[PDB]
Design a protein around this ligand. Sequence first.
Ligand SMILES: O=C1CO[C@H]2CCN(C(=O)N3CCC(Cc4ccc(C(F)(F)F)cc4)CC3)C[C@H]2N1
Ligand code: NA
Ligand code: NA
Length: 295
Amino acid sequence: MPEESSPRRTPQSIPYQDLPHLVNADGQYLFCRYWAPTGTPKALIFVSHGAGEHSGRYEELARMLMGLDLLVFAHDHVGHGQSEGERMVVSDFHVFVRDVLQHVDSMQKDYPGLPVFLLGHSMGGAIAILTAAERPGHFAGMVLISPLVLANPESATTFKVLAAKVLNSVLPNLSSGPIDSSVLSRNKTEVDIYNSDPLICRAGLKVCFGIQLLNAVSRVERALPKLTVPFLLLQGSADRLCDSKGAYLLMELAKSQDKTLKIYEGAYHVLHKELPEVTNSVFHEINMWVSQRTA
Ligand SMILES: O=C1CO[C@H]2CCN(C(=O)N3CCC(Cc4ccc(C(F)(F)F)cc4)CC3)C[C@H]2N1
Ligand code: NA
Ligand code: NA
């Protein structure tokens, strides 16, 4: 008698049968998270995390959104958190977009006729932009927290050189240095939390992944005149990871009739984990923006 193989487990050895999950088009398990209100939801909202991190870092934002009667859902992108895949490796950046769309399509089957929003931060924001651009008119709105539109100019040069080296030669171990945690937030407790979370990948960025980020930046630039979705854009003026010039470029080139930019003077990259004065405003602004577009 043939027997069923050992239960499939997360990279942290937890069986997927014990967790909310989804199997993507490549047969990879994605870890899922849901925050549903007690009553019938007013809308759905997918939360898209950034590079090296995971969906668990959006707990407080998700609970605020659930408090507005939205059903919030997320998954860890391939190669991240509790999902399968080699850490910070992606065959093509579009895999992230394809997987967000599969999850959105699955949820819309269970909640037909409900409006669907996107919330994305950093690389997660580039994923949200490419997702909305692929399906014009499908999403009700997008909330972008320091999205990856334009890389810091120095980092763009570093990866363009590194990409051109492996274009010509075979170097599978080639990597840049790790992301400098001190530039994440002026809130040192949040810097310390980022450095303590075992689900966060704090290794150097592999060149193959850097190439996919270069692809993401190029694709976002081409997508901007196709963007019509309503959006709220939040950006720190002292962001060393996603250049503030990108937020101004997105406001200028997107065709969206409903677009708003809020700049946080002196703030670093992770606005929803910044100094309390910034974080409290970020939460309030998202709450007002979503409340106005779900009422
Ligand atoms: O809460 C957090 C924890 O981690 C923080 C750092 C990484 N982060 C992100 O998603 N990140 C921020 C850092 C950024 C670095 C980067 C590297 C190459 C390129 C290229 F190749 F195009 F030139 C562009 C940009 C990549 C995207 C999430 C953020 N948010
Ligand atoms: Na399949
Ligand atoms: Na429904």
